């Protein structure tokens, strides 16, 4: 054929990757046990002759 050997070339480049939030999937959900974050203690002292709130 005419100019056989001058094969057409298909070039790929300039790749870019977006992200689709709606495509989200998750596996098995693990929930840990309650862990003590913090503690505050105190004393309420009543030296009067009546209950105090």
């Amino acid at each position: 054929g005419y100019r056989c050997g001058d094969k057409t070339a298909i070039k790929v480049s300039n790749f870019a990757y977006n992200l689709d939030p709606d495509s989200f999937k998750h596996g098995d959900v693990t929930q840990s046990d309650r862990q003590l974050v913090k503690t505050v203690v105190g004393w309420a002292v009543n030296d009067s002759d009546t209950p105090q709130s």
Binding site: G1, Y2, R3, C4
Partner: protein, 53 residues
């Protein structure tokens, strides 16, 4: 022998029943130079007018 476009114009050792040929006394194809065209002296626009008409 020289082959046609279908053969991609290949020139290969061989022989054929016809043959390209070139003059043994080639003629020069140079563009002849003619006698000058003389325009009478005048204003620029007048000279151009006489030339283009």
């Amino acid at each position: 022998v020289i082959m046609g476009p279908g053969y991609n114009g290949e020139i290969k050792p061989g022989t054929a029943s016809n043959t390209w040929c070139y003059p043994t006394n080639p003629v020069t194809g140079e563009i002849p130079t003619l006698s000058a065209l003389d325009i009478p002296d005048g204003d620029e626009v007048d000279v151009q007018w006489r030339l283009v008409h």
